[PDB]
Amino acid sequence: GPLGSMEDFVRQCFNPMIVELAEKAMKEYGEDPKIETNKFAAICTHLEVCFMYSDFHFIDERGESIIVESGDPNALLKHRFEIIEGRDRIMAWTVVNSICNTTGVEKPKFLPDLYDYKENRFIEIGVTRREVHIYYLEKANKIKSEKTHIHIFSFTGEEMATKADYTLDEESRARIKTRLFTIRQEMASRSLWDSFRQSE
Numbered sequence: 001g002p003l004g005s006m007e008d009f010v011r012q013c014f015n016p017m018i019v020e021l022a023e024k025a026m027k028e029y030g031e032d033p034k035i036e037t038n039k040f041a042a043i044c045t046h047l048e049v050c051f052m053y054s055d056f057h058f059i060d061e062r063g064e065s066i067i068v069e070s071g072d073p074n075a076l077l078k079h080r081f082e083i084i085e086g087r088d089r090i091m092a093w094t095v096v097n098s099i100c101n102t103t104g105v106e107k108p109k110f111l112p113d114l115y116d117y118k119e120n121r122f123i124e125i126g127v128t129r130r131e132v133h134i135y136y137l138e139k140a141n142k143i144k145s146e147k148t149h150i151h152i153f154s155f156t157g158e159e160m161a162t163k164a165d166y167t168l169d170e171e172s173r174a175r176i177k178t179r180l181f182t183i184r185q186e187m188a189s190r191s192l193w194d195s196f197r198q199s200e
């Protein structure tokens with residue numbers, strides 16, 4: 001079929017909030033979304049996975065973690081996850097320092113992606129077009145925080161997480177994997193996938 005543009009794909013398949021946050025992030029690190037378009041799609045994808053990872057997860061009135069998929073969560077509920085990725089560096093570290101001073105959890109060297117109030121730990125989210133073990137080792141070598149939990153997703157449904165601790169229920173992670181599958185399929189229908197996979 002005809003080759004589409006990755007730009008068109010990203011604008012059409014991702015929520016504008018996500019697209020906007022991704023553009024601001026790329027701009028901040030001096031990369032242009034209109035040139036680094038595969039990177040642009042990868043950044044939107046990673047952001048979306050971070051949001052989906054926290055979606056619907058709350059801490060209840062008793063302090064137990066629960067899932068609430070209705071539009072209206074009970075007002076006494078607390079979000080289970082703090083989202084760190086997608087915030088400018090100043091606000092991101094402000095949130096990190098807050099969490100650290102509040103919970104007692106040690107401060108990370110690099111900005112992680114999430115904080116889990118149930119498991120009491122920061123999380124680094126990875127999304128890869130390559131083999132998950134390879135990508136896992138690269139991120140572990142980068143951060144080496146060793147308190148920061150790592151959770152890798154691939155576009156073909158594989159996962160790898162620190163100590164074989166996957167944090168979320170199968171259903172939550174299946175939502176994420178299904179989304180990645182749809183992204184891959186749609187890219188392929190626009191003949192964007194081969195270039196996107198190999199560009200990582």
Ligand SMILES: O=C1N=C(c2ccccc2)CC=C1O
Pocket residue numbers: 025026029031039043085086111
């Ligand atoms: O949102 C981010 N984007 C990054 C980026 C952007 C363009 C090229 C390489 C890394 C790095 C770290 C982030 O938190």
Ligand SMILES: O=C1N=C(c2ccccc2)CC=C1O
Pocket residue numbers: 021024025028085086087088089
């Ligand atoms: O995720 C980031 N978002 C940034 C951002 C977000 C909104 C407005 C300006 C910069 C800056 C750096 C990041 O790593």
Ligand SMILES: O=C1N=C(c2ccccc2)CC=C1O
Pocket residue numbers: 039042043046085112113125126127
């Ligand atoms: O895991 C991350 N990967 C990023 C990324 C992904 C693809 C291309 C450029 C940056 C940005 C921020 C992260 O936490």
Ligand SMILES: [Mn+2]
Pocket residue numbers: 025085086087
């Ligand atoms: Mn960022």
Ligand SMILES: [Mn+2]
Pocket residue numbers: 085111112113
């Ligand atoms: Mn991040």
Ligand SMILES: [Mn+2]
Pocket residue numbers: 046113124125126
């Ligand atoms: Mn990440």
